[PDB]
Amino acid sequence: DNIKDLLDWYSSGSDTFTNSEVLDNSLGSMRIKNTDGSISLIIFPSPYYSPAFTKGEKVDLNTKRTKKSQHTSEGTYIHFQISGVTNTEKLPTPIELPLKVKVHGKDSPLKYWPKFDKKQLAISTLDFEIRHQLTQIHGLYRSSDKTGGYWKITMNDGSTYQSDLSKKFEYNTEKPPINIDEIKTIEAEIN
Amino acid sequence: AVVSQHPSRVIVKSGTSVKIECRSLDFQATTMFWYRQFPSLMLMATSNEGSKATYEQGVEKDKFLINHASLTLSTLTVTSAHPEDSGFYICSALAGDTQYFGPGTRLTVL
């Protein structure tokens, strides 16, 4: 079942790496060396978000695993992941993104909604964090009552993004990371 | 057939990040679990080697990092810990569907 698969995906943890280094950058992928010596093989299936970082540049990872991490021999640890590579620029001070949540029409307060100190996040990362808040604190995917809905971001400059809580994120058509200090509102509704 | 949990006791000031290790001493472990007891026993997360942990209702992934890179060890880290996170934490592991439990860790945050 597919509400169960959404729950397992969005209620599990994510890998957050800082100042990892690009080893290779092919079409559709990146090969990165993390500061703990793990290697990340990351898939990028969208022609609208094709990371352009060159060999030896520093990147941040906020991403999810597509299958079980494995050891080689030597014994190098390899992570298989999807999306979620950005630059390393930081904001001066961490900020709370402006999330408001509703569950069947009613305002639901947040708990453990973290601050971010990065300038940009992939949309796929905004997806999994918005939905993590929903699955952990507000019941998304955990009863028949609460299995679909949406979130929608709105920027200072008018533009928007939305995802449908009833379905997987659209990795295939993901758009470039955005500046999070220019997010005007995020609204999420469970239905 | 026994699991260890170090440290058994932690006392730290708000904002400190705490690491607790859970180990298989004399057997081949697969899944490990992390619980928390309110003086009852609440499952927080389940963790398989190589994958990211799965978190139960009420538990936020980045407050409770879990690392689990070998069949023998898993590490919970309560990141930026705050007084309300004070309590008793217990780990267990399955063997290769019986759980074997660690002695636990008493945590005090001030």
Three-state secondary structure call for residue B84:
helix
- Name the one residue in this structure whose structure tokens are 């809580």: A165
Q: Do A167 and A108 lie in a common domain? A: yes
Question: Among A55, A70, A85, which residue terminates a domain?
Answer: A85
Owning domain of residue A164: 1-14+86-191
Q: Do A104 and A187 lie in a common domain? A: yes
Q: Which of A97, A85, A87, A77 is CA-nearest to residue A37?
A: A77
Among candidates A65, A69, A136 on the partner chain, residue whose Cβ is nearest the Cβ of B60: A136
- For this experimental structure, what is the resolution in angstroms? 2.4
CATH number at residue A152: 3.10.20.120
DSSP per-residue codes, chain A: -HHHHHHHHHTB--EEEEEEEEEE--TTEEEEE-TTS-EEEEE---TT------TT-EEEEEEEESS--EE-SS--EEEEEES-EE---EEEEEE---EEEEETTEEE--SS---EEESEE-HHHHHHHHHHHHHHHS-TTTSTTSS-EEEEEEETTS-EEEEETTS---GGGPPPPEEGGGEEEEEEEE-
Mind telling me how many Å the CA of B60 is from chain A's nearest CA?
Answer: 7
Q: Do A94 and A161 lie in a common domain? A: yes
Q: Which domains does chain B have, with CATH numbers?
A: 1-110 (2.60.40.10)
By what technique were these coordinates determined? X-ray
Q: Do A151 and A111 lie in a common domain? A: yes
What are the start-end ranges of the E strands in chain B?
3-6, 9-12, 18-24, 29-37, 41-47, 54-55, 64-70, 73-78, 87-95, 99-101, 105-109
Mind telling me how many Å the CA of B45 is from chain A's nearest CA?
Answer: 9
B69 to chain A, any CB pair closer than 8 A? The answer is: yes
Q: Structure tokens of B43? A: 């499952």
Chain A hits for B72, CB-CB cut-off 8 Å, are none
Q: Do A75 and A92 lie in a common domain? A: no
How many domains does the structure of chain A reveal?
Answer: 2
The b/e string for A89-127 (b: 16+ C-beta within 10 A; e otherwise) is eeeeeeeebebebebeeeebeeeebbebebbbbbbbbbb
B9 to chain A, any CB pair closer than 8 A? The answer is: no
Q: Do A92 and A118 lie in a common domain? A: yes
- Would the CB atoms of A12 and B51 count as touching at under 8 Å? yes
